[PDB]
Amino acid sequence: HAVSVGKGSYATEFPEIDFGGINDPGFRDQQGEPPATIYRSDRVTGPMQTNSWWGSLAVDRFSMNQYPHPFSVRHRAEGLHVFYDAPHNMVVHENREAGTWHIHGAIGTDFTIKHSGTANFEQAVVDDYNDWYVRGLLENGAHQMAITYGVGSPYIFVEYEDGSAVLDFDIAPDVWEMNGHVIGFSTHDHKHYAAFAPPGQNWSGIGSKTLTNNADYIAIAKLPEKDGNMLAKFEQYAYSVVRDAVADWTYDEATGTVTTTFEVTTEAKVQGAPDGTIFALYPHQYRHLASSSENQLLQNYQYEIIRGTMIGLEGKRFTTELTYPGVLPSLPDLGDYDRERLIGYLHDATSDYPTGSDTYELGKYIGKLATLAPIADQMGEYELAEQFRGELKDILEDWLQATNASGQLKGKNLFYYNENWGTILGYHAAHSSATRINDHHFHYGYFVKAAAEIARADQEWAKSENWGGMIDLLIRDFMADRDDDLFPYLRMFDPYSGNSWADGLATFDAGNNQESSSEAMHAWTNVILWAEATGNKALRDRAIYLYTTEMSAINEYFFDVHQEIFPEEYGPEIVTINWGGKMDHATWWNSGKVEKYAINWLPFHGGSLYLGHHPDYVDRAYEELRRDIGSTDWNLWSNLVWMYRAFTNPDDALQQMEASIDDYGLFDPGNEKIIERGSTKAQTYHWIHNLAELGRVDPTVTANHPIYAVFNKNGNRTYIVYNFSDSPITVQFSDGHSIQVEPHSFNIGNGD
């Protein structure tokens, strides 16, 4: 059975897969479904949230190791293990022959939070969650322990049924402050914590390995320092348990400002407890803190974690402000290229084909075609552009239908709605996109790219009663709004951490991870273009919110542009994979040197200009990679490096491109030395030459519409706008400049 959505459809029964003769158990196991068992209480109904920092709690019987910074925690039969990575736990390791580096801590236990009545819970389940906290529930009949925690919370809130509190240590802690019902303590290795019980419920066991308390409520805090004034501050909010937490945003189109307010609602566990908490802010938040939140900062309240320094802030809410910088549907026709040569490369691209039947490889191919089409238009090759768009339509009109000619479900090239979790899965699948609900933004982002390029030339096709409904459905899978009947809220995105998490299950002792931040940014860019093309303001603004917030996380945790987060002894100028608990210069497959950088640059598209906002970073990263290679003889993906290099030095990029671009003949799946397989010569040539004429990205200038870019070459500014509207528009830039744009066109460099 299947459900119609305009001219398309999706499957509601798991299809009989067409393996196409392939016997490899790997490929066949990829054509499955996500886990049947979900560890959630009957309070958690509707589409299950995935791609979370906390997801292992939902998937494994207890949990794996999690990073509600500043803590790490894990659920066990015996209770909740709590740990903090102090500097003596932190390490930086290099494997020279592998070309990898690892910044990590340890899987230890500072202490265990336990229930007086049982050390043998049956399971731990998700009993509730919000935008960034979760409520874990350890269950053993009448015995329950409910633990509320989250990223950015220096508290762990503990609620007991049919028992009371126990804190268990391997080595007896130093209780340096005993206020009866509040204690300040330190581990044998000098890690400072506190525990809070209601007044009159005093702690026993002081001086021993086990601290007990008769209360049915306690809180644990990580203290920034061994300091009784801090303890007194933590005491004020220790009885205010977080029940709701919401990240509300606005996009002000006139200024480009994306404003996000993070707000909790708490429940008082003693008389008079304030409605509020103490937040621990990550760098990407506090570097952008609103003026009106500055007075809530607790200045000396600092935690060192993998993502650098966190700082304390008290109250009900705080606000961040970021600047959306615009995106483009593509670069315009402004380069000093040889036009017959670019036309030749466009014709050469007709030899390209997908190197796989799965959603990722197929996605890469349709991203390639979608990128060529507007370049072909610019060169006056409208037939060729139309050929590319036609191929896009045939592929999409296939994948977006679940049923064949006879009305039966297909065995491949279809989407299926898994009801158990509430997600759209594509078959053929790869990289655990269906078995783990991984990488939906990475894969489906390319499908939206394909659709946005079709919509730019053909609004009729993109209507919801036609093929638009199924495109809006894919988008909803990976970035649904609130109260969506089929999907959880913003699946991929962690509003507090500021980045997308790529693994649907998060069953790793380093928490969740994200490798290709650029493929995430690509997904958000394409939803912006799709939504602008189809007149969907609400959807567009949400993708703007995501593009802009994720940008802020990328610049800190992947690039460290400010040079404050990576340890000094860390050699690379990039982190490739960010986890909850660690950072890797490494890829998910066995790769060489360029790939461990370029996996956070690709693919290149009209939303990629964010990569050039920090020219010194771009120089610094390129120079480090060049030093490690020993030359400009790139081990793989040379064109991606040339393209990146053009952000700060297009002459040098031009020189490397001329020397080697034509070593590559026509498309060869087995050789990505020069041209990465999701990329083309045409794209490479068009991009570098455009950058050579335009100069540098100028993020200091904004516009009062969202599809634009500003460049600066030695003080001379080029302003670029694309107009998706049927009517002309006028665009005001923040430096006083004003331009007029005709319908369905760029303001300059439309080509022919």
From Swiss-Prot:
One of the record's GO cellular component terms: extracellular region
Q: Which reaction does it catalyse?
A: Hydrolysis of (1->3)-beta-D-glucosidic linkages in (1->3)-beta-D-glucans
Annotated stretches, region: beta-sandwich subdomain = 1-224
Q: Where is the GH81 domain?
A: 1-695
Asked if the keyword Secreted belongs to this entry, the reply reads yes
Does Cell cycle count among this protein's keywords?
no
One GO molecular function term of this record is:
glucan endo-1,3-beta-D-glucosidase activity
Binding-site list for (1,3-beta-D-glucosyl)n: 360, 364, 431, 439, 443, 503, 513, 515, 519, 672, 677
Q: What is its EC number?
A: 3.2.1.39
> Region (alpha/beta subdomain) spans which residues?
225-323
Keywords from UniProt, A to Z, are:
Carbohydrate metabolism, Cell wall biogenesis/degradation, Glycosidase, Hydrolase, Polysaccharide degradation, Secreted, Signal
Which cysteine residues pair off into disulfide bonds?
A: none
Q: Where is this region: (alpha/beta)6 barrel subdomain?
A: 333-695
What subcellular compartments does it reside in?
Secreted
Described purpose of this protein according to its UniProt entry? Cleaves internal linkages in 1,3-beta-glucan. May contribute to plant biomass degradation.
Cite the domain annotation text: The CBM6 domain binds the non-reducing ends of beta-glucan; this domain may therefore target the enzyme to polysaccharide termini in damaged regions of the plant cell wall susceptible to catalytic attack. The CBM56 domain modulates binding affinity for beta-glucan and aids binding to insoluble beta-glucan.
Which family does the record assign?
Answer: Belongs to the glycosyl hydrolase 81 family.
> What is the protein's given name?
Glucan endo-1,3-beta-D-glucosidase
- Which organism does this record belong to? Halalkalibacterium halodurans (strain ATCC BAA-125 / DSM 18197 / FERM 7344 / JCM 9153 / C-125)
Span within the full-length protein is: 28 to 779 of 1020
